[PDB]
Amino acid sequence: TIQPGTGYNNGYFYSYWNDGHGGVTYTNGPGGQFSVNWSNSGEFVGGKGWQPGTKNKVINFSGSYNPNGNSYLSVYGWSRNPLIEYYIVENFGTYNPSTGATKLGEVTSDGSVYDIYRTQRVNQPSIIGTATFYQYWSVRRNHRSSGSVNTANHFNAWAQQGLTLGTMDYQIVAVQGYFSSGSASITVS
Ligand SMILES: O[C@@H]1[C@@H](O)[C@H](O[C@@H]2CO[C@@H](O[C@@H]3CO[C@@H](O)[C@H](O)[C@H]3O)[C@H](O)[C@H]2O)OC[C@H]1O
């Protein structure tokens, strides 16, 4: 188990963040592996990947994802200038993050159709401090906890629809939770 923060572990960049609430354990394992076990958590996001991401990375992931409540499993990362939090959501718990959001298209990639959305966070934490910024979403219709994500297909379709990214910051497979419980064990490559 590690403190929230960022660094490298067995060759992979990791980011682990929470809102301080308690109830989440993040573990870096061998190779590209990480595990998250949480019980009546606050908000948190943790996973392994790269710093910086690229616009055409093929990300592979495999393992087990057992949320009990509000949680996502996503390729997750940020761009700078413009500041964007983005999500290629492969699975989730009790909440589809695109509920109520404006649908801005579809993309077919890696065995499923994804629905595309933009949302906005207002004065929320970010990689550069409290800010108001857009989120880009690709929400997979066929949920899964293993597979391959051709991020180019998503970034290109986003750009097509006017969801353009700035300079890439980190890019990970992440388990996210908001006041929920669960376990996950995920291996990235
Ligand atoms: O030490 C600083 C960190 O705390 C900062 O980390 C980022 C803070 O925001 C994270 O994203 C938020 C929560 O879950 C998301 O879905 C919300 O919209 C986000 O508001 C991101 O995970 C962290 O990396 O990074 C900069 C540091 O100075």
Swiss-Prot record:
GO terms for CC?
A: extracellular region
Return one GO MF term. endo-1,4-beta-xylanase activity
Q: What induces it?
A: Induced by D-xylose, dependent on the cellulase and xylanase regulator xyr1. Repressed by glucose through negative regulation by the crabon catabolite repressor cre1.
| Catalysed transformations (reactions) | Endohydrolysis of (1->4)-beta-D-xylosidic linkages in xylans
UniProt-listed Enzyme Commission number(s): 3.2.1.8
Record bears the keyword Signal: yes
pH dependence of this protein's activity: Optimum pH is 4.5-5.5. Stable from pH 3.0 to 8.5 at room temperature and from pH 4.0 to 7.5 at 40 degrees Celsius.
Q: Which residues are glycosylated?
A: N37, N60
What is the top EC class of this enzyme, as a single word?
hydrolase
Q: Which GO terms describe its biological process?
A: xylan catabolic process
The record lists substrate as bound by Y72, Y76, Y87, R121, P125, Q135, Y170
Query: Pathway membership of this protein?
Result: Glycan degradation; xylan degradation
| Catalytic residue positions | E85 (nucleophile), Q176 (proton donor)
Q: Report the subcellular localization.
A: Secreted
Keywords attached to this entry: Carbohydrate metabolism, Glycoprotein, Glycosidase, Hydrolase, Polysaccharide degradation, Pyrrolidone carboxylic acid, Secreted, Signal, Xylan degradation
Q: Where is the GH11 domain?
A: 1-188
**Which domain of life does the UniProt lineage start with?**
Eukaryota
Protein's UniProt keywords contain Secreted: yes
Family under the similarity heading: Belongs to the glycosyl hydrolase 11 (cellulase G) family.
Please explain the role this protein plays, according to its UniProt record.
Glycoside hydrolase involved in the hydrolysis of xylan, a major plant cell wall hemicellulose made up of 1,4-beta-linked D-xylopyranose residues. Catalyzes the endohydrolysis of the main-chain 1,4-beta-glycosidic bonds connecting the xylose subunits yielding various xylooligosaccharides and xylose. The catalysis proceeds by a double-displacement reaction mechanism with a putative covalent glycosyl-enzyme intermediate, with retention of the anomeric configuration. Produces xylobiose and xylose as the main degradation products.
Name recorded for this polypeptide: Endo-1,4-beta-xylanase 2
- Name the species this protein comes from: Hypocrea jecorina (strain ATCC 56765 / BCRC 32924 / NRRL 11460 / Rut C-30)
The uppermost taxa in this organism's lineage are: Eukaryota, Fungi, Dikarya, Ascomycota, Pezizomycotina
Name of the gene this protein is made from: xyn2
Q: Which residues of the full protein are shown?
A: 35 to 223 of 223
